[PDB]
């Protein structure tokens, strides 16, 4: 066994020497002559109220009006953030739901939590309500994030150290993604739906190819549990958020942390991370009851979105990148713009 | 507002009317987290209570007309730092202890240090159940297992003056009983700082009063929360 492990260390030594020789410059000095982002003042236009417990997760719709929000009361509420209306309410079997996704067709909403089941909800039903379209089961851990690929395929990150691509029409795993040694908290799909990064609690993020179920490449540099991960808008980079009060930007072509977003006054844990439509304003979401807005190229705060009363569990930017919805553990969601 | 907008604002208000009806259900039920070890009688505390009154099992019991949800974990893994944050607004935590065994008490104490001090599991009180008192009673009278080996502070210890021994109990058993409580209470009375409280109870396996013990403790918890709303505590 010791021949295997020492071989594994010198592969880590070969990778780290390859990454060190790959870094001729850094993003701090490539972007040191561009104009500063300035102060981005940003306030709440819509305080979406009506939840009964902590808003654990949300997901925007692709039309940038509809959003679903998951809470620990056993409800998914579909919201119209333009008018504060409640488009739908979805009661659940389990009130411990840790994620929800909005499909990019408007036809389905997933949810999943400690019940170890991804429940797909059919919204556009002829009979006139929401029902359980599919109880996707097979995981042996809590589902922490799920995202719809296109209308019949979903990848679910779970607490059994695995990610899994599921066919909703059959209920089965087409492919399974294994390799993480810890709890997997978040996943993010690239904007051509062929690769996805998963951030887990082993201080590493793995890029997976969804088409044959393998890990391309593993990204280290974090030093605690990654609770948040989000792709850059082009698809060549991704940022991460974790408990070490740092956010780190990882390019998929050159495997390094190009920038750490970390001040000394911040001591808490990042729970949610999402970029803008251009990837200039990395909005992160922390445990200091606040949402700091980082410049993604210069490592300075552009403003703090401070309107919440507990941990901001979820944070999402629209697909036209124009409103930010931050949901917290105080049962309120807030539309910043 | 248009004709379809004003009916959509109404359809929000019927979802207000449904969720205010479900807020009546949610506030009148009290979520409790059953988190104990495998050696302990955690399944017995499920079984005894539900007759009298999947990664989550859910036990509901009704004592004096009020609702009491109890959740314990099944298929969840042994890593317990990310899913434990979901139970931050539960009314109480039932920490069932196998007090009779001694090689796994300190593992339960380090479990108890982790729950009591956590930044999101703070403000949650713990209803401490110290199960297997009947087999602890047989073991101390047998005298096979020496507590002094595992804990070298059972030698300079004496039984407290405020102790309440049940009749027909040997003094060594009562000394063994209240030692395990005081190991479990100097964890709790060192970092809470009047934010949450520990309620220790010496319970038998087949005892039929654990619902009343939870209800008497849960009455205190929501009393103390209401005093903090006037800052009385």
């Amino acid at each position, epitope marked *: 066994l010791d021949q295997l492990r020492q071989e594994a260390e010198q592969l880590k030594n070969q990778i780290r020497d390859a990454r060190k020789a790959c870094a001729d410059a850094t993003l701090s000095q490539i972007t040191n002559n561009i104009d500063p982002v300035g102060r981005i003042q940003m306030r709440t236009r819509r305080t979406l109220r009506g939840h009964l417990a902590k808003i654990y997760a949300m997901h925007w719709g692709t039309d940038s009006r509809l959003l679903v929000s998951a809470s620990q009361d056993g409800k998914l509420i579909i919201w119209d953030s333009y008018t504060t209306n409640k488009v739908h309410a979805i009661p659940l079997r389990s009130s411990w739901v840790m994620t929800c996704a909005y499909a990019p067709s408007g036809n389905y909403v997933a949810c999943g939590g400690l019940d170890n089941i991804c429940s797909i909800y059919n919204l556009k039903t002829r009979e006139g309500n929401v029902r359980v379209s599919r109880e996707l089961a097979g995981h042996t851990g809590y589902l922490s994030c799920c995202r719809f690929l296109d209308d019949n395929q979903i990848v679910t990150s779970s607490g059994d150290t695995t990610c899994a691509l599921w066919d909703i029409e059959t209920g089965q795993q087409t492919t399974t993604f294994t390799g993480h040694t*810890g709890d997997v908290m978040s996943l993010s799909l690239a904007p051509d739906t062929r690769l996805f990064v998963s951030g887990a609690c082993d*201080a590493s993020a793995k890029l997976w190819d969804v088409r044959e179920g393998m890990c391309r490449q593993t990204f280290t540099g974090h*030093e605690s*549990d990654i609770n948040a991960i989000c792709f850059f808008p082009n698809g060549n980079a991704f940022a991460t958020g974790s408990d*070490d009060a740092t956010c780190r930007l990882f390019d998929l072509r050159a495997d390094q942390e190009l920038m750490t977003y970390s001040h000394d006054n911040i001591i808490c844990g990042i729970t949610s991370v999402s970029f803008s439509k251009s990837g200039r304003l990395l909005l992160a979401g922390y445990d200091d009851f606040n949402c700091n807005v980082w410049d993604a190229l210069k490592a300075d705060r552009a403003g703090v979105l401070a309107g919440h009363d507990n941990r901001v569990s979820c944070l999402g930017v629209t697909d036209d990148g124009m409103a930010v919805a931050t949901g917290s553990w105080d049962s309120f969601l807030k539309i910043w713009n | 507002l248009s004709a379809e907008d004003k009916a959509a604002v109404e359809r929000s208000k019927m979802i207000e009317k449904q969720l205010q009806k479900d807020k009546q259900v949610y506030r009148a039920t009290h979520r409790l987290l059953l988190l104990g070890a495998d050696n302990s009688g955690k399944s017995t505390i499920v079984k005894q209570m539900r007759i009298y009154h999947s990664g989550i099992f859910e036990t509901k019991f009704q004592v004096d007309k009020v609702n009491f949800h109890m959740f314990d974990v099944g298929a969840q893994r*042994d890593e317990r730092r990310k899913w434990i944050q979901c139970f931050n607004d539960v009314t109480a935590i039932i920490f069932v202890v196998d007090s009779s065994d001694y090689n796994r008490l300190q593992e339960a104490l380090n479990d108890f240090k982790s729950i009591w001090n956590n930044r999101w599991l703070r403000t949650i009180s713990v209803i401490l159940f110290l199960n297997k008192q009947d087999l602890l009673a047989e073991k101390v009278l047998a005298g096979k297992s020496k507590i002094e080996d595992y804990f*070298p502070e059972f030698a300079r210890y004496t039984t407290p003056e405020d102790a309440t021994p049940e009749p027909g109990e040997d003094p060594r058993v009562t000394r063994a009983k209240y030692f395990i409580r005081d190991e479990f209470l100097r964890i709790s009375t060192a970092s809470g700082d009047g934010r949450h409280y520990c309620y220790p109870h010496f319970t038998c396996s087949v005892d039929t009063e654990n619902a009343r013990r939870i209800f008497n403790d849960c009455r205190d918890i929501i009393q103390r929360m209401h005093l903090r709303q006037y800052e009385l505590l």
Partner: nanobody, 127 residues
């Protein structure tokens, strides 16, 4: 990478002495509580000791209470466990482990199987 490489350990006689060092790379050592966990053969993991950031919160399990002592050094990012008098029921694989998150004293799932931020191990055999 979070790499906790703990040296030390060996075939020591009963009553002997051993220092277990723990070199840590990839994280700021002064921001995290550190742990020692041992696994004796075929009876699972067991927490031994824990020192906090810059000391002053040292606590032990009962079986090693007067005997073993822990010391951190926040200069070389090194953790130490000095073992003074060893019984032969102390034979185990001792692991350098770390509190899950930084800036807190909240050590969850340190003794849990397949824990990420725990060392590879070092064998201490007493006979």
């Amino acid at each position: 990478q979070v790499q906790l490489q703990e040296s030390g350990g060996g075939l020591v006689q009963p009553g002997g002495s051993l220092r277990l060092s723990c070199a840590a790379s990839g994280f700021t050592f002064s921001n995290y509580k550190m742990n020692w966990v041992r696994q004796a053969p075929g009876k699972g993991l067991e927490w031994v000791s824990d020192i906090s950031q810059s000391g002053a919160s040292i606590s032990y399990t009962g079986s090693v209470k007067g005997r073993f002592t822990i010391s951190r050094d926040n200069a070389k990012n090194t953790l130490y466990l000095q073992m003074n008098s060893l019984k032969p029921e102390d034979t185990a694989v001792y692991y350098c482990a770390r509190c899950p998150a930084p800036f807190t004293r909240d050590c969850f799932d340190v003794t849990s199987t397949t824990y990420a931020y725990r060392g590879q191990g070092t064998q201490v055999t007493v006979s």
